């Protein structure tokens, strides 16, 4: 009926109504919980294909209305003339068209829902770039590439989406096969181990296949493999004066610069699902700034990743026999300082993890003082180190799922049929 | 009909059956999740009959003997007293594999890989605080055992018409005073200020210092609860020192080794057992960490990171992290070096991870809640973050349960 959240280090306790406009499942029951599932639920708003007119169009005129009511309308002439247009639309092409404010609108409101996501309080400050003209994988990479440029912004780093096709019936989806629009090569070693990013040997591979030359190094930013219309994806290697790269030292560690590290200042996400008013842009790559963490943490510190752990602490001479001399800890911390202070230094926009959980009470704060809630996933949202000294760690959450949204969607390779 | 969980660092898969087992709820809905909350929201002849004999038929289950003869008139002998005396009275066997259960079904702790090496205090017979002080007392050396530390619960009697209740009101068997000063500030564990209080409103007399071990204030029977002082020979206490800081010893930090839990509520086959102390020994975290430096709690940060001269105007300069990790090695070193048991986040959770398996394979599924079984530092360098986890109730469990002081309707004009 109204559910509360309290923070346990202030006491602030906030309540939730807007849960009540939650559609699609959590995956949870009463029975069970499955807040640290990935992938919890395939509940999906609409069936796989084209879908008929009385499946498509109810969602149409939830988003519509939803949109209008945004606006301080409902009911309004411009609102009853366009749910009779989409209706037009869906009975004659089985599909319809969003005006540019109905996208606009749509995209900055699946980041605002995005649960998983602690940069929010940025969410309506998004620049979204229409690419809903786009036809050949050639406009897409002219697309991404502006996108990339506008959005590096020589440092000062902007949010951006860009907005491909939406999907018609399923063999003519437009997608971006990299998960991210920046990313670095893995290579399969002779031996066994992996050279560069381990989480990406397959989507390298395929480039190599597809006839990516690679430079087989450490960081070598990976081609786009880009798709257009469900044709065979195109290989297009990004001008290298649009990757921003921040090279990692150290601002006490002289010996870290020496470790040849460097990451790239772009974090632009390109393998998910935009929803809005039951259409889907499958292709609808966005970016923002990093969290220092992403890099240090996670990218340099999974195990399955960069896994630097090791290599760092022994240059830190530290007690690497046990467990409790907590040598992963310490270097896991000289790492993160080291990756906000090279970005820094050079300019690039970053957030630490002490900054950004703070930001993100406030915009729960905010969210629930103006739209009666603000779902969020503690489990994302927390930070992967020194949790319980940020503030969400403190912070009970409710999770529940909003449109429009950002969801998760097949790699395009399980699903291609070639050409 | 199954449920498949993934590792994403391993992408070993394992399947749970087991939650369809579970009965109680976890607080979520089909659409929104609660698995962050911390707190999700006496019973008769009826209610009490099918919890008596779920929790017998899963016993008897449990040992290969479900519909032996010894079965079925277990059942009839539980039924009858239900009807007698609209309770009943769990064997010693039962006693031990519920409490047991229970430990195996907190979905919260991390340690689980020890749950049956559970040393089980049957204290029903206890009829006073004076009877329950002894029995705490006991649990405390035993558990203690010069450092080597020793996992135990002691069970006092159930509940009866909540009238009676036995209750332990410390949250925890060993824990600093907490004072907070006309200043405003706070000496001691600021946590403890409430319970400290009422300490002294029952007669307390406080040592006024950062580490006074806080009298137990143990309730038996439904009756006023009483204080007494655990005899200081029984509490082992570990003098925190870095073994590269010299000066970490002079922030005068000390901590007690045995943590036992005793505000939680231990429910078997639909009795209640108010007052069940169980205590193991420490993952360093929850003394390094939240012990130390939650800002509610000793608020060590600033104070070591000064002693680090580390940059504390910006937050990116992560001083809070460094001062943190140190803090731990400190807290760690100290135990190991005085040979008090304890168990750093790494080691406690990839016994988990081990143990977590092992649980799938031979039970069918481990409810265990990500949320806590995360350590509170470190995260994702700790196996259990890349570990998908399925939250479930499963009973025999431990629950929470008001504070004494919330209900306690006082005897004492
Ligand atoms: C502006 C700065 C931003 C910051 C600091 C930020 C931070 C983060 C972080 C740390 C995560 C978890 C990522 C991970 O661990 O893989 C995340 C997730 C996410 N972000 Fe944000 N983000 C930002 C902008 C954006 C924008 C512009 C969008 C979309 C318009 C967005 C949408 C999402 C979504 C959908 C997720 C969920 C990821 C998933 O489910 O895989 N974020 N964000
Ligand atoms: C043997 C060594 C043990 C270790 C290393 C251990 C570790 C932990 C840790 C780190 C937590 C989270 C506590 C917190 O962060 O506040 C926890 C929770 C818990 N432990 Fe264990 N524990 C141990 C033994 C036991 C025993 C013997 C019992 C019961 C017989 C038990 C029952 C519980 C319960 C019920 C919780 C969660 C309670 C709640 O919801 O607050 N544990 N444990
Ligand atoms: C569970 C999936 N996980 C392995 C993905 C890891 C990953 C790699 C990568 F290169 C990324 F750019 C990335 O972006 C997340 C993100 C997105 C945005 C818009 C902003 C920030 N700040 N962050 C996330
Ligand atoms: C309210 C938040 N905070 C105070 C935690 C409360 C809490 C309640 C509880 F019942 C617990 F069992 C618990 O576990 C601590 C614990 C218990 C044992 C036996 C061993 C270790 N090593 N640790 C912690
Ligand atoms: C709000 C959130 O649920 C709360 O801070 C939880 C988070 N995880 C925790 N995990 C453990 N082990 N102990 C805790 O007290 C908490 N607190
Ligand atoms: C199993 C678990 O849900 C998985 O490791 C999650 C945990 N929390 C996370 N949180 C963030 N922000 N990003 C992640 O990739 C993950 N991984
Ligand atoms: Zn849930």
Not at 294 to 302: L, N, P, Q, T
Request: hydrophobic share 35%; proline share 5%.
């Amino acid at each position: 009926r109204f559910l509360k959240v309290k923070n346990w280090e202030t006491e602030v306790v906030l309540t939730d109504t807007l849960h009540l406009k939650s559609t699609l499942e959590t995956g949870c029951t009463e029975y069970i919980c499955m807040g640290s599932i990935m992938h919890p639920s395939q509940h999906a708003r609409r069936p796989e294909d084209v879908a008929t007119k009385d499946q498509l169009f109810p969602l149409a005129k939830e988003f519509i209305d939803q949109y209008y009511s945004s606006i301080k309308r409902f009911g309004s002439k411009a609102h009853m003339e366009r749910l009779e247009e989409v209706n037009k639309e869906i009975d004659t092409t089985s599909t319809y068209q969003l005006k540019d404010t109905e996208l606009i609108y749509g995209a900055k409101h699946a980041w605002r829902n995005a649960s998983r996501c602690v940069g929010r309080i940025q969410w309506s400050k998004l620049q979204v770039f229409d690419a809903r003209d786009c036809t050949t994988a050639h406009g897409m990479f002219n697309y991404i590439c502006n996108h990339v440029k506008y959005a590096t912004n020589k440092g000062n780093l902007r949010s951006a989406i860009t907005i491909f096709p939406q999907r018609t019936d399923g063999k003519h989806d437009f997608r971006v096969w990299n998960s991210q629009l920046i990313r670095y090569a893995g290579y399969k070693q002779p031996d066994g181990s992996t050279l560069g990013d381990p989480a990406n040997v397959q989507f390298t591979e395929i480039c190599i296949q597809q006839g990516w030359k690679p430079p087989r190094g450490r960081f070598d930013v990976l081609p786009l493999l880009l798709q257009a219309n469900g044709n065979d994806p195109e290989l297009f290697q990004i001008p290298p004066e649009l990757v921003l790269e921040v090279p990692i030292r150290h601002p006490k560690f002289e010996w870290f610069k020496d470790l040849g590290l460097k990451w790239y200042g772009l974090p632009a996400v390109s393998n998910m699902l935009l929803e809005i008013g039951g259409l889907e842009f499958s292709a609808c790559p966005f970016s923002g700034w990093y969290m220092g963490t992403e890099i240090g943490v996670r990218d340099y510190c999974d195990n399955s990743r960069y896994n630097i752990l090791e290599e760092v602490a022994k240059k830190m001479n530290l007690d690497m026999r046990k467990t409790s001399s907590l040598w992963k800890d310490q270097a896991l911390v000289e790492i993160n300082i080291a990756v906000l202070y090279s970005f820094q230094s050079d300019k690039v926009t970053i957030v630490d993890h002490h900054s950004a959980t703070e930001s993100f009470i406030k915009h729960m704060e905010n969210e629930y003082r103006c739209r009666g809630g603000c779902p969020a996933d503690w489990v994302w949202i927390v930070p992967p180190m020194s949790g319980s000294i940020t503030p969400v760690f403190h912070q009970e959450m409710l999770n529940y799922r909003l449109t429009p949204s950002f969801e998760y969607q097949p790699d395009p390779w399980n699903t291609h049929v070639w050409k």
